[PDB]
Design a protein around this ligand. Structure first.
Ligand SMILES: Nc1ccc2c(c1)c(-c1ccccc1)[n+](CCCCCCc1cn(CCNc3c4c(nc5ccccc35)CCCC4)nn1)c1cc(N)ccc21
Ligand SMILES: Nc1ccc2c(c1)c(-c1ccccc1)[n+](CCCCCCc1cn(CCNc3c4c(nc5ccccc35)CCCC4)nn1)c1cc(N)ccc21
Ligand SMILES: *[C@@H]1O[C@H](CO)[C@@H](O)[C@H](O)[C@H]1NC(C)=O
Ligand SMILES: *[C@@H]1O[C@H](CO)[C@@H](O)[C@H](O)[C@H]1NC(C)=O
Lengths: 536, 531
């Protein structure tokens, strides 16, 4: 060993690690980046469940982020910070099953609450190495141990021929689970407490957290959960076994792969990764937004039944969850495929463009159901006002895909024994490069939770820095105790739990917490109670 | 003998009576026959004009009320008995009433013709709330009201038959309108300025005269209070009238059309009334057994079809609703509702109430109504459920049909003014939870609060004076705004763009936009698509 910072040498079950001392605003942190937690899922292991990483010899260098899992790279607005901040920032490879750990420097004396982040990206993209997921602030300021993992996305993570041995489905979820098992066995080496593990995630990451709540083998690996702008229930986070089969075999056809499952998957395994990515988007059943080709499948194994069935009959007595949404969940999706919408103008649309947007934003809906949506979201005082139509198209997509599934989830969890806290995040970052009409888009709370505004080189306002400190405190208080409130700080306004009776939730913005009742209650009765009865 | 009380009409001489109003005397000619008594072989038949009479006909008292069911839900209760017949029932009931200023006007005066409501099964022009003396005295109006046949006698139809063609009660009204053209000048009225006004079924009747060409030369303007020709209760198809007519005949022991109607004509009047209510196709409220029928004659098509394609360019209309249209209907058949308690109901009672209040609705459609009107913050709160039940019935039957009518008339060239009446009378005997019920604006428009023996407040007297002005200004000019008052807030016309209407209450006029717009989109655009 010899001459190295002794605070950076650590042993886990697979061997020795060397981390790096990083600078955060208030002082140093330790990071162990690029720790392998699985055998590289390459070759005959593509589409297969992950196997645990075999021990290595020598001191593994854990000072840089490892490869990003193979994925489609967004080129809608190339060169534009608003999109590129989500794009991969390391090399793409199928050899991507690595995780990251930040801890205080020096490492904590007594066992510390662990937070595990699961990124989103529609189950087709994402990486734990993106700047907005930087764990250094939470580790330095709140003393947290923060863990994030890469999991397979797209076909590599979710392509399924259900019932098969060679493509069983949900393997990306199994990568996540394996990283959680890794934290149970190994996080104490870093000063983390394996008995206090809080999962948090956004969008597909949040849906992922929800699937770990609903899947029994994952339940012993964590104690609390945070779902930001996503759920396992709802229209995009799962597919039936039949629909996944249909998408897998269509994709196979598109890349020249012909009849039994073994032979089809063996041929898919000979294809270059980039081939699979180039046809991934061509298997969706309609023109649509907020739909992704390869997502968790209701396999009868990882998911013993649909998420809707499991949240309706689950016993959630021992469970604390924090859930919420941003003010404008739907806005950004509109520029990825609704005619009339762009980031470079005000996107004022016509009534005709609104009806056409609804067919795309609600692709599974019949004619009757789409007229119901249109009639519900039309302002009948200004039925043709292009500003109102624009904002209504954003709300349709936001409510159908996020806000109403979250309200449904919170309601079922609460009624069935869970302690639930709910929020709406309404602060638009001063540094946002998306246009004003998009408001607070899907994903733009994350940089505040992780504490980026504390970095003075990023140019957030002082108020934003104080707001980020507040949120970091809510999230880590929740990780520590199951309650986002500070016990010592009595006079600060309280965040009451969500109940079916009172339906309380809080506004997260620059002003002190304000308590509201009813999470889009009238409109979510439309989506969650009425619309389903209009598919019978 | 007072020569202001002697008038010569086409059929002969009349003697009226000088009545006292608060501010001075008025002349009234009550009980003037405008048709041959529609009795015997004339039952179910179009009215024939009254034959001339000899001498001086005494027109100093109200005549008989048209034969009808008398309400016995709350016997001796003012709130119900004020709507019950106040003269003898008879099939011989085709008489009209005229109030005029005393002395009779020097120059020709705008004429207002009232058409009473009562679901096409009841009512009378003789009720105290239809007293024309206040409008006559204070505004100098000539006010006319007529009896028309109701129930089977007025609307029993075997469509296409010669002996029960349907809509005869509407033809009674039309004949009284013809009478006014030929005769009202003798009283100082202007036949060139005739405004129809009516409430509930009386309003739907006014609407049916708008939509029927032969009625259109008999008036110039119209007011429809809490009622429309479109909507779920004011018409039936020819097939459904035939069905109800032949069911009713079966219930009284009768018997082709000729034979069936001849046997019905032998039955005492009360036998017909006894079985009237048993022909409705479901358990329901705000539904009536014998109503105007889409005959292809008086009504050439459904009222929906006629308002959609009509040209209403030279028409001025005033329309509106009260704050709680559906409230009272609830105690006439929805389990859980009574006048004598607060009617706090359960969710289960709300779902059951909706099937009754929207009787034509499928399972899915009734679930949409329940889901729309539930407050999802307080889904089980009994106060919210009670008020929502009232709203369902009021919106489905009155408010939304009115918003649809106003919209179509405005889009198609009519000058339209709309209101919501929100003042609850201090003298109301119905309970607080019913709010401002269907019918309780009428006493204000007719000016009853000006009678100091009736114990309205001073504020109520001044409010009634304001309304009497709006209504008679409208009759005079087609515009309810006082052409003298150079201060605001003016009552603007209703249009499909702006959708402006006004609140009538003790406070000065307030202009609002959108008459239950979201909710009426539900009833008027979505539910039809749920066929
Ligand atoms: N080359 C093709 C061919 C066919 C289709 C393609 C692309 C696309 C397309 C997909 C991704 C990016 C651009 C275009 N689409 C559109 C997919 C539209 C749905 C995805 C929208 C989307 C895009 N991203 C990029 C990831 N970035 C983000 C995020 C998050 N937030 C934000 C906020 C603003 C901007 C981006 C962003 C938060 C979570 C993580 C990632 N995530 N989600 C198609 C759709 C069809 N129905 C059929 C075919 C095709
Ligand atoms: N004896 C029977 C037998 C069977 C049925 C009967 C009655 C009734 C019923 C009818 C009238 C009165 C009481 C009971 N109903 C109930 C019919 C519901 C429709 C009548 C509701 C109604 C009753 N009135 C009385 C006239 N009074 C008013 C009004 C107006 N406003 C008001 C305001 C408050 C109270 C009354 C009132 C304004 C305009 C004119 C008359 N108008 N409208 C049945 C229904 C069915 N589906 C089947 C069978 C039967
Ligand atoms: C904004 O830009 C898009 C795509 O370039 C275009 O289709 C749309 O019509 C524009 N909107 C307006 C009102 O300028
Ligand atoms: C932040 O502000 C500085 C100082 O003026 C500027 O030069 C820098 O480029 C900005 N950086 C970002 C992240 O926008």
């Amino acid at each position: 060993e010899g001459r190295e910072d002794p605070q950076l040498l650590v042993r886990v079950r697979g061997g020795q690690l060397r981390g790096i001392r990083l600078k955060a605003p208030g002082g140093p942190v330790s990071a162990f980046l690029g720790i392998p937690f699985a055998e590289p899922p390459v070759g005959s292991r593509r589409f297969m469940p992950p196997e645990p990483k075999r021990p290595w010899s020598g001191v593994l260098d854990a000072t840089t982020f490892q490869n990003v899992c193979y994925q489609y790279v967004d080129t809608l607005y190339p060169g534009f910070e608003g999109t590129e901040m989500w794009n991969p920032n390391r090399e793409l490879s199928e050899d991507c099953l690595y995780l990251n750990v930040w801890t205080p420097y020096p490492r904590p004396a007594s066992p510390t609450p662990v937070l595990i982040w699961i990124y989103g990206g529609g189950f087709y993209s994402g990486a734990a190495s993106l700047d907005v997921y930087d764990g250094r602030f939470l580790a330095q300021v709140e003393g947290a141990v923060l863990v994030s993992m890469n999991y397979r996305v797209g076909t590599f993570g979710f392509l399924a021929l259900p019932g098969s041995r060679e493509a069983p489905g949900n393997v990306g979820l199994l990568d996540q689970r394996l990283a959680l098992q890794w934290v149970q066995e190994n996080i104490a080496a870093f000063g983390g407490d394996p008995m206090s593990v809080t999962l948090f995630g956004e969008s597909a990451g949040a849906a992922s957290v929800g699937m770990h709540i609903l899947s029994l083998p994952s339940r012993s690996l964590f104690h609390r959960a945070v779902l930001q702008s996503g759920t396992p229930n709802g229209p995009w986070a799962t597919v039936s076994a039949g629909e996944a089969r249909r998408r897998a075999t269509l994709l196979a056809r598109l890349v020249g792969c012909p009849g039994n499952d073994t032979e089809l998957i063996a041929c898919l395994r000979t294809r270059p990764a980039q081939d699979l990515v180039d046809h991934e988007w061509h298997v969706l059943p309609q023109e649509s937004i907020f739909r992704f080709s390869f997502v968790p499948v209701v396999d009868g194994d990882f998911l013993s039944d649909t998420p809707e069935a499991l949240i309706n009959t689950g016993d959630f007595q021992d469970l604390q969850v924090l859930v919420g949404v941003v003010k404008d969940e739907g806005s950004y999706f509109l520029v990825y495929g609704v005619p009339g919408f762009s980031k470079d103008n005000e996107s004022l649309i016509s009534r005709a463009q609104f009806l056409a947007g609804v067919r795309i934003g609600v692709p599974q809906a019949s004619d009757l159901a789409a007229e119901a949506v249109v009639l519900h979201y039309t302002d009948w005082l200004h039925p043709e006002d292009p500003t109102h139509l624009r904002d209504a198209m954003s709300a349709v997509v936001g409510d159908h895909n996020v806000v109403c599934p979250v309200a449904q989830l919170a309601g079922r969890l609460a009624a069935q024994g869970a302690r639930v806290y709910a929020y709406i995040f309404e602060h638009r970052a001063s540094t946002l490069t998306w246009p004003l009409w998009m408001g607070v888009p899907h994903g733009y709370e994350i940089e505040f939770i992780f504490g980026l505004p504390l970095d003075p080189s990023l140019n957030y306002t002082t108020e934003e820095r104080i707001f980020a400190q507040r949120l970091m405190k809510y999230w880590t208080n929740f990780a520590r105790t199951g309650d986002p409130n500070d016990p010592r700080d009595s006079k600060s306004p309280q965040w009451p739990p969500y109940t079916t009776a009172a339906q309380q939730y809080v506004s997260l913005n620059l002003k002190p917490l304000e308590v509201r009742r009813g999470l889009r209650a009238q409109t979510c009765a439309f989506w969650n109670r009425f619309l389903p009865k209009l598919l019978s």
